[PDB]
Symmetry: D2
Subunit: 386 residues, 4 copies
């Protein structure tokens, strides 16, 4: 009955179930949650762990003694429940000081502060056991063309991430970074807008091995992109360090619906890929229970995230294991896709008349791909209509 347990490695941000419901046009619909209560409630649902921005766990502007007490209470809740903290991150977007960015703010003093704020929280993350440190530069970007020279901003972004890599190396930490792309919102355009742009940027860092991506379902879908395809490219690059799961209906504001909502077939193909690839990181939900809901609806929405993942996991596994699907995959030449094109080498390909002079293009063209039968088997498996 698709019941999650901590072995399933499902995690949630404090800010997810804790979202009070404020939007562009609306005041809060729910009271604030104490992190202790969210840890307890999430553990009861079968979650494995929780994640946090600095300012979700310790109110911004807290004294040292307040900080210590917030962390102490949180640690007790983790210990009481067995919940883990696999990932943490910095809030470089809410406070007005970050209105033009953190790491790529035009004001240099703000860039330096953003780095100090991040470093302080890396130390805390490591204390709480986090393996991954996410960075979503939601304020990096512009509403107008003159406001932001993007080459200069990328220079600043590289400096910042290189400094953070120097810092973790200096401390001997085993934490790695995961850069989270988003195309827009809250800035008119955000820098590193997709998985591809973030992967490309990482290759230019001083120590690329320390950095990967944290793609989010809805973010790539805000650019109309295929989220499973982007995850495949991240896996191909060896850079899927973390993932954010939720739902989105296309090219809109970021909806943050529960996982499985939004594009259901994309959710199916995502689960199929993560499971086929043996992704071993957390299945993290970055979602918002709609502001229509009370707390009972918050916990129902969170439970639904995990339930939908588990249903889709079952159906994708059944699809791949079905001998009729295995035959359809061969009929569609998925086996041939996985074979090298020219392991014989360049000269042999050049000398191979079957590749040009004697290639019957019409006979090859006439061979159907059989993709529709394959896809209807996939549909039948998803819907439990076999």
């Amino acid at each position: 009955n698709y019941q999650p347990t901590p072995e399933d490695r499902f995690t949630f941000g404090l800010w997810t179930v804790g979202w009070q419901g404020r939007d562009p046009f609306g005041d809060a619909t729910r009271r604030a949650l104490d992190p202790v209560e969210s840890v307890r409630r999430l553990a009861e649902l079968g979650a494995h762990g929780v994640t946090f921005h600095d300012d979700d766990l310790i109110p911004f502007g807290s004294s040292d003694s307040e900080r210590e007490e917030h962390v102490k209470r949180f640690r007790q809740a983790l210990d009481d429940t067995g919940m883990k903290v696999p990932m943490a991150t910095t809030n470089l977007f809410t406070h007005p000081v970050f209105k033009d960015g953190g790491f790529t703010a035009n004001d240099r003093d703000v860039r330096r502060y953003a780095l100090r704020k991040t470093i302080r929280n890396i130390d805390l993350a490591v204390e709480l056991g986090a393996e991954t440190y996410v960075a979503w530069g939601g304020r990096e970007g512009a509403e107008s063309g003159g406001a932001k020279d993007v080459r200069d901003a990328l220079d600043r972004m590289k400096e910042a991430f290189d400094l953070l890599g120097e810092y973790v190396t200096s401390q001997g930490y085993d934490i790695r970074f995961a850069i989270e792309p988003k195309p827009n919102e809250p800035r008119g355009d955000i820098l590193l807008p997709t998985v591809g742009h973030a992967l490309a940027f990482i290759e230019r860092l001083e120590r690329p091995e320390l950095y990967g991506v944290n793609p989010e379902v809805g973010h790539e879908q805000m650019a109309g992109l295929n989220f499973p395809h982007g995850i495949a490219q991240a896996l191909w690059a060896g850079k899927l360090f973390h993932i954010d799961l939720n739902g989105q209906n296309g090219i809109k504001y970021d909806q943050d619906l529960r996982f499985g909502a939004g594009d259901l077939r994309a959710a199916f193909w995502l689960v199929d890929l993560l499971e086929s690839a043996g992704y071993s990181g957390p299945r993290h939900f970055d979602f918002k229970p709609p502001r229509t809901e009370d707390f009972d609806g918050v916990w129902a929405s969170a439970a639904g995230c995990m339930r939908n993942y588990l249903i889709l996991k079952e159906r994708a596994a059944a699809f791949r294991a079905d001998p009729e699907v295995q035959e359809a995959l061969r009929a569609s030449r998925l086996d041939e896709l996985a074979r090298p094109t020219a392991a014989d080498g360049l000269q042999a390909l050049l000398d191979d008349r079957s590749a040009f002079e004697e290639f019957d293009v019409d006979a090859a063209a006439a061979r159907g791909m059989a993709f529709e039968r394959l896809d209807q088997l996939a549909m039948d498996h998803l819907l439990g209509a076999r």
Copy 2:
């Protein structure tokens, strides 16, 4: 009066002005153009050169003697006009054999043929003087999730591009490749859907220095992305080997409107960036005169591409040179964006109380960015309303 000359380095594909007007829903509205006539007409408008797919210059399936004659006539037209051929490319999308791809077709024999077809045309491109060889993998992708394992497809794509790099190296050619991303159309999703994804892929090739990107205005805009920002990231990476200029109205089918049409302000900021950066490659137009037009309208639309570039060039230069704009840029801290965040180094930043313990976040937050005044100066310059 914004008159182009060959010194402006404007180029056009044969398939642009030569588009007969067939669309998803429509038969041709114009007769076919002889490439000789297009070279002559484009030169009269002040173009610098033309580009071609193999199958635009030599009909698919031509004999050797037909090939020779098509090339001879084209060479005569180039010589008669002084037109250049800076770029060429392969058609790996029209023939039905490529219905599932060229380099990433599931059928291995098709992948090998695609490579042979490409190599044949690289030789021709070099003979005609081309410096850049574009690859738009418009058939690489899928309409359904099971049809294409993207990790396997990227393995095949890397093999193909690595073989092409081995080939040009073996021949001692000074041609470089430019990979053209597109998010969708004609496939439901295309592999390497954006500039970022293509840049990331190139970093995993055996000889990355041989490959860059050929971004197209409308392609990035089909994902709702900021084209100037993506061009900035390509320039930051040293990978803007070629560019395709046209117009697009957002998230639709690829419209291929003349340059300056579609998103006019994005066209302004693009020109500003190319000119500020000293981009020295061709300003290539990959556009389609609308099928409403006769040949007179074809040539008017082509002329408009160049005219709009030159108007925007004038206005962007005036913007950057205006001392009132220079003052506004300082007021908005664009100068500070260009300064290193922490050239003092990590330890100095950690020990700098002005960066954390004594940083007045409220005073920094209160300082307006002055971006709206800057942007209205930009608007006034674009519109000739100063």
Copy 3:
């Protein structure tokens, strides 16, 4: 096992299964189908009927004796199979004469021809038993602002539809019209771009009762709209005269995927609505088997259209009949949504202190909507995970 029969009222256009695979970038991948063969193949799959544009059944430019023979053969196929022809339409988009429109072409002679071409085919439609005559004005619109004065074009569009209404009235036909909106493609913007715009236009015709809409799943989704919501508004207006079923992934070119593909949850909610409302018109598929497919894949894709409708029909009925769902609907106040707001009348509402002076806004605000639990029951029913 979700087997369709003619009682299910599934219909297909000749141009659907008959699509040869030509796209923006690609030549045909399949040979042409004789309409007789498509009628036979569709009947074997359990279809109820077929639909046609004039020029799909009789090649454009046919002589009277060729026309007669094409119709005779088609009629024999219908008689051999028991297939019906519930709908027909005019091709006012393929021939180059329609490059600026049919009914709203700037050239008046083209507008008059479009009307004559339509009237000729209305007569044929009635002979073949069609109840509905669709009009998709795919060429009505513009790529540029000066090319088309939309008020003038709407005047021309109204004249055309009013003339067609006068014609059917004059002949005593019992056929009604169904206007098909689309937002763009092949024109940069199409007139009457959504269900709403078409509904609004109809209200200004001389005999609105003769006209309704023919909404298409993918067309509304090309504007990012909620297709079930638009269908609900059409049903509310009494104007759902016909419907086109297919799949689409968001804001792209019109994909015409098989029904159930694309946005699966939207397909579920659509079926739920059509069945709840007792829609009694044809379930018509306007789709294209992908050009990757051979004929076996064409028929598999067509079969999948019907299969997916029947699966979704079963799941939506089970959802609505489940007493746990019925309780959840009451918990979410769907019953209260269906009750008049103020059947007591305006003055009673004005005098009702419970509506203002004594309304406890905080108590009402605190009551959760319970929509997430309801939606997860819907998900569980769709996936067969109850």
Copy 4:
């Protein structure tokens, strides 16, 4: 120098320049503005008037004596400046009670309260001289399919608007309503998502003459629609009662950029249409100065709204008055578009061999539309490059 004066009829919402900068992800960046100060500042810029939601002028939950004092101060500011109040509206979206809607909330008590809250503010609007009463049902809609039966919701929406019409009739007010469509945000899908849907709905009200639309540039652009085309359809219907001017870059969250920003060419064609049509209502700006800005930037952004309208007005008038453009319009048959198709009547069209039997489709097809030359004249006029 494009200086606005009150004769230009530019108006602004209190909530525009008064936006404190809170977004999905961000706290306020500016202090609250007293409405008195905004009236004074806007008048100094040359505005004609201001508009308000109830809760922008009188804080929600105010006592009668607080209400009276807020209104008194506002009235004094209007009198001090000569500013008008042409439009008012109700906030049926911020307070948590409206989390599922106002007029279409599932809770009936909320629907009744929404009506009472609206009626109270209609009285105030009339006292302050407003001619138009806007209704933006931003909370009417859903995030999930089961939560909202749209036919039932439209029944509730019609009841509400019919009651409001009964109310204004009963009081003898000369105020009219303007319904503001939006496709999404804050709800996943909003009811009446476009101009077309709102126009269609109005036709089903009890007294349609009392209601029109208040279209917003960015709202229609959030569906990828052509805003000038939608305005043309509203004008064709006689229903453009008010308009909201701003800027938007395509399919995103609602950006609310200053007018002229976003899609500049669409802004040009909009101004051309409003001025050609002789629209005599307010030119109202519903925009948000970006949260990067301080108050000086707020007023610069507001000034830019008006400046851009005036520049575009000049250029559109010059375009239409240019005899070379007038000749190009005739060459493109815009004159013929404006002539009736068949004033000779149906029978004459049926008997006209020039319309079918003797229509030379190839000769008509061959005649180019000359739209690209026309559009480049339009570009040249916009850019001041003639």
